Amino acid sequence: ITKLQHVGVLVNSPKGMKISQNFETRYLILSLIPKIEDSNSCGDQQIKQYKRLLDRLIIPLYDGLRLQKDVIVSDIEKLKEAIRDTNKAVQSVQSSIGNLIVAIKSVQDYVNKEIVPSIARLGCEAAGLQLGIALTQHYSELTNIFGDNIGSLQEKGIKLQGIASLYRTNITEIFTTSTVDKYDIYDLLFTESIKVRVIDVDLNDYSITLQVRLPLLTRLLNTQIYRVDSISYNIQNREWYIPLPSHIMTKGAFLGGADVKECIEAFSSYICPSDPGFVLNHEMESCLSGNISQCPRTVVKSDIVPRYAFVNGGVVANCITTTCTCNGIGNRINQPPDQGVKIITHKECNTIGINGMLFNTNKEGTLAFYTPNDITLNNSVALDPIDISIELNKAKSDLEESKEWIRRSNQKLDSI
Amino acid sequence: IDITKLQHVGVLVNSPKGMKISQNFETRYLILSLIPKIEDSNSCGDQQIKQYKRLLDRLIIPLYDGLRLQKDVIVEAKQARSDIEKLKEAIRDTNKAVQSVQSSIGNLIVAIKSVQDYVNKEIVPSIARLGCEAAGLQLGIALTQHYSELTNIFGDNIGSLQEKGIKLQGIASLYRTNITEIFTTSTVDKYDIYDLLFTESIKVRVIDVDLNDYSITLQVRLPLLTRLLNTQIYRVDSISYNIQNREWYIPLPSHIMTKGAFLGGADVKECIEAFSSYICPSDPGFVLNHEMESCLSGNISQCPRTVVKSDIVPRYAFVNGGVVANCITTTCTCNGIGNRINQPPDQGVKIITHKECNTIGINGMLFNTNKEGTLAFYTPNDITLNNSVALDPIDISIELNKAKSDLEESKEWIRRSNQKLDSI
Amino acid sequence: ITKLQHVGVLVNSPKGMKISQNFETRYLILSLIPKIEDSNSCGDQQIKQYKRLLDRLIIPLYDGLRLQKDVIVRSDIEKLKEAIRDTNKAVQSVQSSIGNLIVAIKSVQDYVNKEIVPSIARLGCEAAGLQLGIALTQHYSELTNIFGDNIGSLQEKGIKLQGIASLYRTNITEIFTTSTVDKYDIYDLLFTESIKVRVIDVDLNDYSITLQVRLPLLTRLLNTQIYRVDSISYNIQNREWYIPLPSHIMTKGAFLGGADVKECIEAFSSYICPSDPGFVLNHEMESCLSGNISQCPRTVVKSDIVPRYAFVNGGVVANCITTTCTCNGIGNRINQPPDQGVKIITHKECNTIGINGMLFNTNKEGTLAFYTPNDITLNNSVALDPIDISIELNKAKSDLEESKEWIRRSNQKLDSIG
Ligand SMILES: *[C@@H]1O[C@H](CO)[C@@H](O)[C@H](O)[C@H]1NC(C)=O
Ligand SMILES: *[C@@H]1O[C@H](CO)[C@@H](O)[C@H](O)[C@H]1NC(C)=O
Structure with a gap:
């Protein structure tokens, strides 16, 4: 597999494979x-x-x-x-x-x-x-x-x-x-x-x-699965398009298409129930491999064929047949005969536009908070400690007096 | 951009829906x-x-x-x-x-x-x-x-x-x-x-x-x-149909797309059907072949139809609640095995509504209407709080009364005691 | 449908069909x-x-x-x-x-x-x-x-x-x-x-x-049956062939076709579809799948991308001529008569089947594990020893009883005046 962007095909996210x-x-x-x-x-x-x-x-x-x-x-x-x-x-x-x-x-x-x-x-x-x-x-x-x-x-x-x-x-x-x-x-x-x-x-x-x-x-040793998107492309004054499967595979020096229907995409590889590879017809096979003269290209005559696609933070498009703006609907983006498509980057154009449709960069919103109500535990219910000391202190004070009088009654009771 | 004359050729295009990209x-x-x-x-x-x-x-x-x-x-x-x-x-x-x-x-x-x-x-x-x-x-x-x-x-x-x-x-x-x-x-x-x-x-x-x-x-x-401006998407099911005593069927994609004045198929696979429209990361459309496109646009005499010889080909389909069958190679029984619904060799298929026939019949299978069952409840058992009853207070008055009652009687005696002691 | 294993097509688990x-x-x-x-x-x-x-x-x-x-x-x-x-x-x-x-x-x-x-x-x-x-x-x-x-x-x-x-x-x-x-x-x-x-x-x-x-x-639906089918590259004579077929097949009465179970949900004894998922195959393939094997759209294989092995009912089916199948260890290679198209490897025949060095073993069991809450033990309420003053209280009546006597005494010494 190569770099056949000049023909509208874009192979991206290269990844390994594992069978579960x-x-x-x-x-x-x-x-x-x-x-x-x-x-x-x-x-x-x-x-x-x-x-x-x-x-x-x-x-x-x-x-x-x-x-x-x-x-x-x-x-x-x-x-x-x-x-x-x-x-x-x-x-x-x-x-x-x-x-x-x-x-x-x-x-x-x-x-x-x-x-x-x-x-x-x-x-x-x-x-x-x-x-x-x-x-x-x-x-x-x-x-x-x-x-x-x-x-x-x-x-x-x-x-x-x-x-x-x-x-x-x-x-x-x-x-x-x-x-x-x-x-x-x-x-x-x-x-x-x-x-x-x-x-x-x-x-x-x-x-x-x-x-x-x-x-x-x-x-799996030496197996890579790439994702591929194809867009229309211009050569001279004619517009072409090559439809291909969604994913390509590479086992050793062999290439074919990968059907990931039953698999799951992980971080650096796909985990599959079994090898997803399948064979493509010699044409796609050679086209993808390099002999570009064989690509199953079709002249595009319908508005249905896609003239742009989103790839890793940015857009790829045919700016000849699609009007690509840079930072406003007034800045037309050119694309030299050299290539068949232009890779508009968000680094280049913050808000890249396609036929009016504006595609910007993720916009941060106002921070949000999931917060509970502050709880304050109003302690138990206190009771003033009972107090009787004033009364008891008198009882004990009269008590004494009582004793004194008895003391006196006795010394007075002394008459010998 | 699609003629619904297609119906007479067993091809039904369901509800229209818009498309949005995310x-x-x-x-x-x-x-x-x-x-x-x-x-x-x-x-x-x-x-x-x-x-x-x-x-x-x-x-x-x-x-x-x-x-x-x-x-x-x-x-x-x-x-x-x-x-x-x-x-x-x-x-x-x-x-x-x-x-x-x-x-x-x-x-x-x-x-x-x-x-x-x-x-x-x-x-x-x-x-x-x-x-x-x-x-x-x-x-x-x-x-x-x-x-x-x-x-x-x-x-x-x-x-x-x-x-x-x-x-x-x-x-x-x-x-x-x-x-x-x-x-x-x-x-x-x-x-x-x-x-x-x-x-x-x-x-x-x-x-x-x-x-x-x-x-x-x-x-x-x-x-x-x-x-996506002026883009609609329809679901399309196909049944068999009879035209001049021969029975045909047309194999067509699940979804079709309408972009301006062009049309083709929609590979909704990696997309999500919402209410007003489908929501996809990219545009689902792809290009059909000359014959198929023409067929769907209107040139009915272009449809890649086939003679049905097997019993695999569907002779009916559910769409819009009601059913849509080929009542010639099938026996559509309106409201009970009794009354049979007929279809002229002219038409392609018969559209049967659950409003006309409360229980559509198609060869023994009775497709009825949603029948409401018994209302059901998920209710917690009623709760009642029995706050502990108060404590009969403490009463020591009867004791305190006799207590003070005597303290007086006592004081009395001390008066009398002091009394006699004063007449000495 | 039949026993097409000789050409590498494997018709698996047979389930019925119901529409909802x-x-x-x-x-x-x-x-x-x-x-x-x-x-x-x-x-x-x-x-x-x-x-x-x-x-x-x-x-x-x-x-x-x-x-x-x-x-x-x-x-x-x-x-x-x-x-x-x-x-x-x-x-x-x-x-x-x-x-x-x-x-x-x-x-x-x-x-x-x-x-x-x-x-x-x-x-x-x-x-x-x-x-x-x-x-x-x-x-x-x-x-x-x-x-x-x-x-x-x-x-x-x-x-x-x-x-x-x-x-x-x-x-x-x-x-x-x-x-x-x-x-x-x-x-x-x-x-x-x-x-x-x-x-x-x-x-x-x-x-x-x-x-x-x-x-x-x-x-x-009656007499309807849905099968899952896998295809693997087989070997007849010295040539290596491969027959690509749809993932699912259906059987209705005496006829057979494909099945688009996409919009469908496989249950236990059958698939539950929103409608009959069967479609017709081209004569050649339909014929092939019904015995006439001289009709199978077989293709010569020249790439390692074509599947040479497949997992099936807890076992593997493989072309052990174009693949190096090893049974219970990389030294023990499994052979295949130039006749049969593929070999059906069983975990019962091979505890550990190995395909080109890739090992597919039996399933080992790890240690039982537990999700348990810490033991809760309730340290009862807060107990208060009762109040005791009956000592101090008795020292009260007692003293009154002593007082009662001191009075009884004072009285008599008076009852003797004269
Ligand atoms: C490209 O492929 C064709 C057909 O197989 C072959 O005849 C031609 O020589 C090839 N040229 C290249 C690019 O190798
Ligand atoms: C199927 O095989 C038979 C012999 O088993 C052969 O004579 C016949 O030509 C084949 N069927 C078709 C569709 O030609």
């Missing part, structure tokens, strides 16, 4: 509910809910798997009575205290029979809740990664975060049987060739078993 | 922040933030590693005898009785102080903590939701190096009110952006991940469609 | 917010929040549909009393204390009643709220998984198993409710995700989404 036939099969077990242990069974009510949620997920995948399997397979006396009085007075101050004690005891038992237990329960409920958040973030994450896999019983690609559960810290380690290039796995990701299919579901453990099949690419 | 793009960055600024001086949600960040790490890291791999490949006292000693003693005893009572008070004004301490040093901070753990939970839910929402909208993009389309809710952050503000660079039709949505032509690739601030950076590529 | 034109429309109603019954409005905020979340999800779908419809349409007796007055003043001071105590006590009570009890209930409320949020959050999560792909585009999309889950109750057959469908037919519908659902209408007030499920009804 061999593969490694690993199985991945998804466990939907973590081993949960809570002594007092606080997170009990919640576990129950999280399971009914899982069932709504698992059960359908089950019924489906079962269907698939189903098909496939009177003076002293005054002082006397004055004592009796004061005495009866002390006896009542007793029953008084005898009641403050009961009152005080009742308070204790309240605090123990109601308040403390409540505080307890509340915490239990809140421990349970804390678990709900946990399970929920799990179900969330679970579904986001293997959600499309758990939804169909057919093969599917696998997200990066799903592959991340196959290797520890080096993606290469995904293949635990062979050794693989950094390069080779990249072609796998960019192509999403790694496929996953759900094989079974255990309704009791709440686990889904997936079968992933990793392709092992076989590289 | 070569002008509008790059535009979208920054995803997976964690909001959080304010809580008491650090009551520290444990959740931790939990949340770890959740994001599991999600983000793989995207990160993948981008790195790509970036790499690419680039006792005496006793009382006399009654005055008996009084001295009698009162000396009561003093001790009082001294006992005051001993009892000391014990109570300790029992109370202990309560004022149990409550203050334990019942309170304990309750305070519940609210603090509860604030954490509040933030968890929220944070959990932001994740669930984020993963839904961008989870398809976040999980691949390959380019993907944006969901409606994704695009939602590219405009404030009109879905048009989508493009900032240019001005675009309601029609032009509808073809974009309907086709999922708007695509985005993840560019960089920032593991520290927990943010992903997407590049949205909005394409700008160039409408 | 008869559809069964069925509407599905998505309710994003369930009916909530909260008497004391404990979950108010949490609900206002969830809705704010459903809006950031619904709205866009709305704005989207709008754009669409918008476009589509100084003695002893004197001494004795100075001492009793003293005693009384001491009893007075006691009463004063008992008062400051009776006060302090009610105060305690009031606090627990006017500040703690309430505080306990509020906390109880906040939880009921938080519990609702868990629910709502989950619902949102579950629902965005099932229909989130549909809700995000306005083009038709397939439907997940768990999505189909709400069309039937027990048998997956009750999916269609206007006809009766083979278990076989729905499996082809599932295996193909032919069932499509398109978002029809959204309601911003009741937070609901209406979806239309399009359920295809397959019609089966």
Whole structure:
């Protein structure tokens, strides 16, 4: 193959080829509910809910798997009575205290029979809740990664975060049987060739078993696949055009056309189920190879034949039959008899125009943001600590006085 | 430029549609922040933030590693005898009785102080903590939701190096009110952006991940469609037809193109059918051969027809809901095996409408109309909240009342005590 | 059709054919917010929040549909009393204390009643709220998984198993409710995700989404069979030939032709086309494919581009005359009588078939892998040892009982005056 632009054919993006036939099969077990242990069974009510949620997920995948399997397979006396009085007075101050004690005891038992237990329960409920958040973030994450896999019983690609559960810290380690290039796995990701299919579901453990099949690419020696676009071209005052296949191949010193219908284009090569090459008729064969005298050219008489095509950042066109402008509809672009087409470059003309149609360079837009609302956690609800010191301090202060008077009553009681 | 006389020759050209080329793009960055600024001086949600960040790490890291791999490949006292000693003693005893009572008070004004301490040093901070753990939970839910929402909208993009389309809710952050503000660079039709949505032509690739601030950076590529002036595209199906007792069929491309006054075929292969038009990277058209072109333009006597001898050649086709068959070499039964629909040896084919015959018949096969089935629902089970009932308050009044009730009765007696003591 | 392996054409996997034109429309109603019954409005905020979340999800779908419809349409007796007055003043001071105590006590009570009890209930409320949020959050999560792909585009999309889950109750057959469908037919519908659902209408007030499920009804063509065919360069005598043929072939009754399965979708037991994909081949080829092998449009090969080997049913078919086929190692070459056109290499005959050094092995199995969540263990609530003052309280009655006795004593020493 050469440079037969002068005849309107443009061969570009040269690329290698690999055949995907061999593969490694690993199985991945998804466990939907973590081993949960809570002594007092606080997170009990919640576990129950999280399971009914899982069932709504698992059960359908089950019924489906079962269907698939189903098909496939009177003076002293005054002082006397004055004592009796004061005495009866002390006896009542007793029953008084005898009641403050009961009152005080009742308070204790309240605090123990109601308040403390409540505080307890509340915490239990809140421990349970804390678990709900946990399970929920799990179900969330679970579904986001293997959600499309758990939804169909057919093969599917696998997200990066799903592959991340196959290797520890080096993606290469995904293949635990062979050794693989950094390069080779990249072609796998960019192509999403790694496929996953759900094989079974255990309704009791709440686990889904997936079968992933990793392709092992076989590289091909000396094979290159190019893309080709043909445009009309002028020679003297006549316009010609050569229709050719979309892709050309090169195996050793042989060339032919490549049918990439079933393949997938990777970064530096195409990964195919099998060699895509096919033979062209001697004419195209010689034309492409160099003997330009053989090109299957046709005189163009219809507006249908394309007179321009886009190639790697820029346009290729027949500027004789198509009006090519440079940076405005007033700057006509010439093309010497020398060639059959002109390669207008965006470096050359920022806005290259073809028959009025303006083709510019990617225009940056205004930056966008996906942002959540700022959350401020207005702390709990505070309670002012109770204060009785002022009262208790007086009780203890009267108390003392009481003692002093008794002290005095005794030294006065001294009359020997 | 195409005569629909072609119909009489079993060749049907479906609906007309325009064509647009996609070569002008509008790059535009979208920054995803997976964690909001959080304010809580008491650090009551520290444990959740931790939990949340770890959740994001599991999600983000793989995207990160993948981008790195790509970036790499690419680039006792005496006793009382006399009654005055008996009084001295009698009162000396009561003093001790009082001294006992005051001993009892000391014990109570300790029992109370202990309560004022149990409550203050334990019942309170304990309750305070519940609210603090509860604030954490509040933030968890929220944070959990932001994740669930984020993963839904961008989870398809976040999980691949390959380019993907944006969901409606994704695009939602590219405009404030009109879905048009989508493009900032240019001005675009309601029609032009509808073809974009309907086709999922708007695509985005993840560019960089920032593991520290927990943010992903997407590049949205909005394409700008160039409408190809006076170009239409039709889909074309061909059936067999009878003309003078001979049965013919014409093999024709799937699609045809109309450019000005020229015509040919359309290789829509690498293109995408939208609503108003097809959207292709380049012009799909190619040139048919003299015979075929002429045939389609009108010179019906040029059609590369063939005699049907096999049963492979289609004798009917669905187009415009209804059916179009060759009712001569086929038996078209209108509304039930009974009534047969006839076709003069003159015409080419018969166009049967589901309006005339509710259930078209073609040799046993009954092509009917969409039949509506039973309305179905996806509804969550009704929820009801049973806020814990309040706690019957504490009542120690009956006890406090008798308590004060006596304190008076006591004061009384001391009056009488002081009374008799005053008449001495 | 036959056994044309002798000329290098390999007719693979034989499948039947069904066309899909008869559809069964069925509407599905998505309710994003369930009916909530909260008497004391404990979950108010949490609900206002969830809705704010459903809006950031619904709205866009709305704005989207709008754009669409918008476009589509100084003695002893004197001494004795100075001492009793003293005693009384001491009893007075006691009463004063008992008062400051009776006060302090009610105060305690009031606090627990006017500040703690309430505080306990509020906390109880906040939880009921938080519990609702868990629910709502989950619902949102579950629902965005099932229909989130549909809700995000306005083009038709397939439907997940768990999505189909709400069309039937027990048998997956009750999916269609206007006809009766083979278990076989729905499996082809599932295996193909032919069932499509398109978002029809959204309601911003009741937070609901209406979806239309399009359920295809397959019609089966008789005696029709579609085969996949591969062609490889063969070797007859010392000359090397190649016969190029279409990728798919069809068999109808006693006739055969090609098949343009392009617009078609291969299922399990058959292909599901929007219409019969058969076309006729030129006499020569038609004849060739039916036995008359002297009619095969064979071409002499002179390039390495012509396929000399092909993958088939977990094995390889190759021209081991123009290709160097090795069985179980590069030293063991496989031969071929100048007669047969090609050799059918089986992985059972060759664990590792090698074509020109390129190795095609059996499939090895890597290590089982696990996606498991860290073990969660709940450290119970926060427990408070109960309050205990029964010690200090007993030291109270006891002292009163001592006091009671000191009085009983003081009385009798008086009961003996005279
Ligand atoms: C070009 O091809 C023709 C036909 O095969 C041959 O006769 C002629 O000599 C060739 N000339 C070149 C360019 O080698
Ligand atoms: C097919 O082969 C027969 C003999 O098997 C031969 O006589 C005949 O000419 C061939 N058919 C055609 C179309 O000529």
